[PDB]
Amino acid sequence: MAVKKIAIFGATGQTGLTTLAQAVQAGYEVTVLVRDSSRLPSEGPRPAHVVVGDVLQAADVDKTVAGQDAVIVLLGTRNDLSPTTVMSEGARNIVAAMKAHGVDKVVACTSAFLLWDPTKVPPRLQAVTDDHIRMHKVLRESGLKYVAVMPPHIGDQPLTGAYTVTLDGRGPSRVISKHDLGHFMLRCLTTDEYDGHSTYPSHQY
Numbered sequence: 001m002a003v004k005k006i007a008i009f010g011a012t013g014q015t016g017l018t019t020l021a022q023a024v025q026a027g028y029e030v031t032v033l034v035r036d037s038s039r040l041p042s043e044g045p046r047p048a049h050v051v052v053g054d055v056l057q058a059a060d061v062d063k064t065v066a067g068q069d070a071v072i073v074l075l076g077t078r079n080d081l082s083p084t085t086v087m088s089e090g091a092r093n094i095v096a097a098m099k100a101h102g103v104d105k106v107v108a109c110t111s112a113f114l115l116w117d118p119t120k121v122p123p124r125l126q127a128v129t130d131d132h133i134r135m136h137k138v139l140r141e142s143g144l145k146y147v148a149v150m151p152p153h154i155g156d157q158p159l160t161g162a163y164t165v166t167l168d169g170r171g172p173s174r175v176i177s178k179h180d181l182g183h184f185m186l187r188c189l190t191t192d193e194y195d196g197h198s199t200y201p202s203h204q205y
């Protein structure tokens with residue numbers, strides 16, 4: 001039986017916006033949690049349901065996850081590189097809401113640094129990476145069906161749907177377009193082949 005209803009967390013971010021647009025265009029019934037609805041567009045495809053709130057508030061997350069078939073996580077810290085627990089605490093809330101509502105599939109973005117040599121993270125990105133690691137741990141230990149998406153640099157190239165997905169962080173490039181990353185998150189809703197795996201999408205544009 002196929003996924004029809006999804007929640008997207010981080011839908012207003014760079015990857016989230018295009019994932020949201022793609023998901024709605026593809027026929028999903030999409031719910032988003034946003035702190036600030038002005039960051040959603042008017043033009044283009046529109047989510048079916050908007051919850052205004054914060055991933056750090058369990059009740060807001062619970063309302064967003066209720067009734068879904070799957071969850072996509074595209075949380076991040078925008079240009080804030082300071083020490084942080086937002087993503088991992090958000091993930092804890094997401095896991096608890098999934099378990100409370102019977103939702104068993106989550107596709108969540110961290111970064112290719114979690115596949116590459118862990119001693120080879122630029123210093124300025126280490127604090128954010130440490131919270132990606134905490135988030136990955138929360139999701140992997142949840143025992144839910146979890147696809148770990150670990151992209152390299154997120155670019156602005158057009159959608160292709162032609163990227164390569166490896167399991168080890170090696171591949172044709174160190175870039176994935178935001179649009180292709182979103183397309184891949186959606187693909188993960190219609191296969192089990194990546195459940196319990198780490199995935200590395202990349203493409204030469």
Ligand SMILES: NC(=O)c1ccc[n+]([C@@H]2O[C@H](COP(=O)([O-])OP(=O)(O)OC[C@H]3O[C@@H](n4cnc5c(N)ncnc54)[C@H](OP(=O)(O)O)[C@@H]3O)[C@@H](O)[C@H]2O)c1
Binds near residue numbers: 010015055077
């Ligand atoms: N940039 C890169 O090249 C790169 C490479 C690999 C991995 N990544 C990782 O990939 C992920 C996606 O990156 P991105 O650039 O698409 O994301 P982004 O533009 O940073 O967007 C972050 C999203 O998270 C939401 N968010 C943050 N705090 C929240 C909170 N307390 N409650 C609810 N929502 C919250 C933001 O909401 P608002 O719109 O309200 O701010 C926004 O929708 C990030 O974890 C990033 O670190 C990035």
